[PDB]
Amino acid sequence: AGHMVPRVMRVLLLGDVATLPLRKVLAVVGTAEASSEHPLGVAVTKYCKEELGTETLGYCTDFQAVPGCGIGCKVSNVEGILAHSERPLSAPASHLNEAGSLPAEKDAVPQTFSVLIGNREWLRRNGLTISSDVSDAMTDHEMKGQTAILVAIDGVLCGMIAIAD
């Protein structure tokens, strides 16, 4: 129909330190937030970053849209930063060799975080409270004036973004 991106109006807390530190989550959230994605969220994160006095940045994001669910994304790297590297430059080759066999095996995926975003109903149906229809009507209702978006971490409460043209 049309094409127009709104702007962020305000952010509300929807997380807790019962699952993880908001500081760390904010660090990653900021890494991706500043990574760009919203016509304001980036400036919001970058702004908070400037006010935080931390230019943190070194995470690997991986957004994706899921049907009959909503939106989602993953971020991992804090692990790599936690544990320095050791010259990540291998040379895989030579197989036909009579009896070579290169010692290339064993891999323990690092800690990866998944953040899901979408309508409150999505999160509700994901594994929250309140009725999906109730929350759905609420979220949709808001769309009749403003834009409401809920952000959950690993299907857990984290925070929601409120957009107001």
d(CA 160, CA 152): 8
For the chain, the 3-state helix, strand and coil shares in percent, each to the nearest 5, are 30, 25, 45
Amino acid at 157: L
Torsion of CA 57, 59, 62, 63, to 10 degrees: -40
Look at the chain and report how many structural domains it folds into.
Answer: 1
d(CA 14, CA 19): 12
d(CA 29, CA 75): 9
d(CA 48, CA 20): 20
Say which experimental method was used.
Answer: NMR
CATH assignment of the domain containing 150: 3.40.1110.10
